């Protein structure tokens, strides 16, 4: 599991911050990890160390082995857990509606569908007139830039895979090594 | 609501969240019924306890 | 602790910072709840 | 029928929170909510 | 799709109509506010032909009126999405082709019209034609179109169509 | 969500017996024949002639027995009755057009079968 500690080297790099990461570095050696030793070594605060440990406990990152004196060992199989749910939420914000180019009247900032201004469509002017005011309609304008968000997320969320490729690959090859 | 949204929007210490989740629980259990024993009563004016919804239809 | 206990310490070779991860760290707050590992596999099937 | 073997705690209740010791775990509304979300 | 279905309705009578010829007075009052006023949930009410039975008139407490339930068979038109229909063009514009099926309005977007029939605002009647001018679709032209989507509001119905599909154009 | 391409009708359309532009056209004058007699009645509606002026300019067939046969034509066929009314007001001439007109009849019969009925239609339809 030396390359299992390598997926770990890449997640600490990829995610948790210096204060967390320094503690996580100690977690590297899964031989013996007491609370008094880790406190004295990290040169951290006891309340604060307890917060980080409690945070790591929340990850189920560690299996608190009681004597009382403690020991801590990896539990996260949630690398997929962050993945399946995050991909869902990003694909929700990505998947847009349609051209959804509803007429919108710039004077009253009222919103219409292509259907809304179609009933309004004024045959004497060959264009679309707003309802209560005859001022000509415009594009959905700003409204929801879900299409720009789709493009951005795609570049941004899938652009972090290459830098994660080292670990996405190590994990995959390490899991195969574990059998 | 608005101050808890931003406080766990940035990953707080996971300890201010207990004592403010209890605040939210209290505040929302304050609107509906206040005459439940325990639960120190809330007040705004001159010692006026709240007139909860179940208190509005006595 | 503000300016009290200190560990000057050195490690680096490049890493990534994810804005969406920050939202995901907070959109995955389940902790104890169970029955989630199987759901992940069902979404990939 | 149903398959499981573990125990259940003795869920106490205190003020606005509820405790449970078979290990005194104070129950979360999200947790019991997800528990309820699965009853047929 | 022109359907011949059975539905029902109720009429409130004012007490000044009682007496002789009470029953037929329900009939004339039936035709008016049921036909020629299309709805959204059942489609288009065009004409009724038979009235099956008139229920018993329940005198509601106070307010005088007596309500008689009635059962009738009325031919109804209700178009569906994906339906193919022949239509008439009522107005031609650069954003598309306006056609109309009976009382229903219909819009054909230009992107849903084959590129061969390019828009021609230069002609005194605005039109859609092939570069070779093999065909020139304009106003009051008879065409076949495919319903891409339908609408029903208060009493007016609309649909949206496409000429891109095969076997479409003048009929 | 409600599309006749996927054949989703409301469950109220089980006894929804249908008709085409000519049978509509037939009774439309009988309602005008109702306006002939039964005097002391007001004017007509607007949609009544608006549809009548539309579907009388274009017809699908010519007379009664032309349809009285074509409904007996599709009588013995293994059909959804929705199918008959769709092409009764289409008048197609090529079989793959009809299956380009219908997203649902690719995989029912031979192509020439409905083409033969298309031939049966173009044989009975008197063009001018
Ligand atoms: Zn306006």
Curated annotation (Swiss-Prot), chain A:
Sequence positions bearing N6-acetyllysine: 57
Assembly information from the UniProt record: Tetramer of two alpha and two beta chains. Interacts with TAF6/TAFII80. Interacts with ATF7IP. Interacts with SND1. Part of TBP-based Pol II pre-initiation complex (PIC), in which Pol II core assembles with general transcription factors and other specific initiation factors including GTF2E1, GTF2E2, GTF2F1, GTF2F2, TCEA1, ERCC2, ERCC3, GTF2H2, GTF2H3, GTF2H4, GTF2H5, GTF2A1, GTF2A2, GTF2B and TBP; this large multi-subunit PIC complex mediates DNA unwinding and targets Pol II core to the transcription start site where the first phosphodiester bond forms. (Microbial infection) Interacts with varicella-zoster virus IE63 protein.
Known role: Recruits TFIIH to the initiation complex and stimulates the RNA polymerase II C-terminal domain kinase and DNA-dependent ATPase activities of TFIIH. Both TFIIH and TFIIE are required for promoter clearance by RNA polymerase.
Residues annotated to bind Zn(2+): 105, 108, 130, 133
Covered residues, full protein: 11 to 203 of 439
Family statement drawn from the similarity comment of this UniProt entry: Belongs to the TFIIE alpha subunit family.
UniProt source species: Homo sapiens (Human)
Organism superkingdom: Eukaryota
Protein name according to UniProt: General transcription factor IIE subunit 1
Start-end of C4-type zinc fingers: 105-133
Locations listed in the record: Nucleus
Domain HTH TFE/IIEalpha-type: from-to ranges: 4-80
Organism classification: Eukaryota, Metazoa, Chordata, Craniata, Vertebrata
From Swiss-Prot, chain C:
Coiled-coil residue spans: none
Origin: domain of life: Eukaryota
UniProt subcellular location: Nucleus
Family label: Belongs to the TFIIE beta subunit family.
Function: Recruits TFIIH to the initiation complex and stimulates the RNA polymerase II C-terminal domain kinase and DNA-dependent ATPase activities of TFIIH. Both TFIIH and TFIIE are required for promoter clearance by RNA polymerase.
Assembly and oligomerization: Tetramer of two alpha and two beta chains. Interacts with FACT subunit SUPT16H. Interacts with ATF7IP. Interacts with SND1. Part of TBP-based Pol II pre-initiation complex (PIC), in which Pol II core assembles with general transcription factors and other specific initiation factors including GTF2E1, GTF2E2, GTF2F1, GTF2F2, TCEA1, ERCC2, ERCC3, GTF2H2, GTF2H3, GTF2H4, GTF2H5, GTF2A1, GTF2A2, GTF2B and TBP; this large multi-subunit PIC complex mediates DNA unwinding and targets Pol II core to the transcription start site where the first phosphodiester bond forms.
Disorder association: Trichothiodystrophy 6, non-photosensitive: A form of trichothiodystrophy, a disease characterized by sulfur-deficient brittle hair and multisystem variable abnormalities. The spectrum of clinical features varies from mild disease with only hair involvement to severe disease with cutaneous, neurologic and profound developmental defects. Ichthyosis, intellectual and developmental disabilities, decreased fertility, abnormal characteristics at birth, ocular abnormalities, short stature, and infections are common manifestations.
Protein's recorded name: Transcription initiation factor IIE subunit beta
Organism this protein belongs to: Homo sapiens (Human)
Upper classification of the organism: Eukaryota, Metazoa, Chordata, Craniata, Vertebrata
Span covered, complete protein: 195 to 239 of 291
């Amino acid at each position: 599991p030396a390359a299992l500690k390598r997926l770990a080297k890449y997640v600490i790099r990829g995610f948790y911050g210096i204060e967390h990461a320094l503690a996580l570095d100690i977690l590297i050696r899964n031989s013996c990890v007491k609370e008094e030793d880790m406190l004295e070594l990290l040169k951290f605060d006891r309340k604060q160390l307890r917060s980080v440990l409690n945070n790591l406990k929340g990850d189920k990152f560690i299996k608190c082995r009681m004597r009382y004196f403690i020991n801590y060992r990896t539990l996260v199989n949630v690398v997929k857990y962050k993945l399946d749910h995050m991909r869902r939420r990003i694909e929700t914000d990505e998947r847009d509606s349609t051209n959804r180019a509803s007429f919108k009247c710039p004077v009253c900032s009222s919103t219409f569908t292509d259907l809304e201004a179609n009933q309004l469509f004024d045959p004497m002017t060959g264009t679309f007139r707003c309802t209560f005011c005859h001022t000509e309609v415009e594009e959905d304008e700003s409204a929801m830039p879900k299409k720009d968000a789709r493009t951005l997320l795609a570049r941004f969320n899938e652009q972090i895979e290459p830098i994660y490729a080292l670990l996405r690959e190590t994990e995959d090859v390490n899991l195969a090594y574990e059998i | 609501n608005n101050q808890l949204r931003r406080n766990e929007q940035n990953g707080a210490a996971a300890h201010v969240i207990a004592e403010d989740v209890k605040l939210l629980q209290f505040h929302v259990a304050t609107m509906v019924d206040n005459e439940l024993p325990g639960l120190p009563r809330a007040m705004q004016k001159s010692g006026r306890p709240l007139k909860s919804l179940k208190q509005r239809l006595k | 602790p503000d300016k009290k206990k200190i560990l000057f310490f050195n490690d680096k070779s490049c890493q990534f910072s994810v804005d969406e991860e920050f939202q995901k760290l907070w959109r995955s707050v389940t902790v104890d709840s169970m029955d989630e590992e199987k759901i992940e596999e069902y979404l990939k099937r | 029928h149903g398959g499981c073997g573990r125990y259940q705690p003795r869920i106490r209740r205190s003020g606005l929170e509820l405790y449970a010791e078979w290990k005194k775990i104070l129950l979360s509304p999200e947790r019991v909510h997800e528990i309820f979300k699965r009853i047929s | 799709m022109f359907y011949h279905i059975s539905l029902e309705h109720e009429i409130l009578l004012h007490p000044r109509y009682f007496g002789p010829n009470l029953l037929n007075t329900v009939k004339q009052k039936l035709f008016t506010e049921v036909e020629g006023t299309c709805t959204g949930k059942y489609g288009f009410v065009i004409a009724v032909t038979t009235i099956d039975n008139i229920g018993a008139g329940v005198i509601q407490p106070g307010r005088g009126f007596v309500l008689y339930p009635v059962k009738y068979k009325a031919i109804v038109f209700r178009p569906f999405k994906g339906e193919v229909v022949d239509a008439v063009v009522t107005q031609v514009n650069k954003v598309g082709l306006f056609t109309e099926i009976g009382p229903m309005s219909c819009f054909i977007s230009r992107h849903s019209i084959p590129s061969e029939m390019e828009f021609d605002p230069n002609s005194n009647p605005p039109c859609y034609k092939t570069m070779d001018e093999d065909i020139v679709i304009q106003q009051d032209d008879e065409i076949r179109l495919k319903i891409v989507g339908t609408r029903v509001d208060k009493n007016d119905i609309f649909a949206i169509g496409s000429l891109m599909d095969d076997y479409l154009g003048l009929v | 969500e409600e599309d006749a391409s996927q054949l989703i009708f409301p469950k109220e359309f089980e006894t929804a017996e249908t008709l085409l532009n000519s049978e509509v056209h037939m009774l439309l004058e009988h309602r005008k024949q109702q306006n002939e007699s039964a005097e002391d009645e007001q004017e007509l509606s607007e949609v009544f002639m608006k549809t009548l002026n539309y579907t009388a300019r274009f017809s699908r067939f010519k007379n009664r027995e032309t349809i009285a046969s074509v409904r007996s034509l599709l009588l013995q066929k293994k059909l959804h009755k929705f199918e008959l009314a769709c092409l009764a007001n289409l008048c197609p001439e090529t079989a793959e057009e009809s299956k380009a007109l219908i997203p649902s009849l690719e995989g029912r019969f031979e192509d020439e079968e409905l083409q033969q009925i298309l031939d049966d239609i173009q044989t009975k339809r008197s063009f001018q």
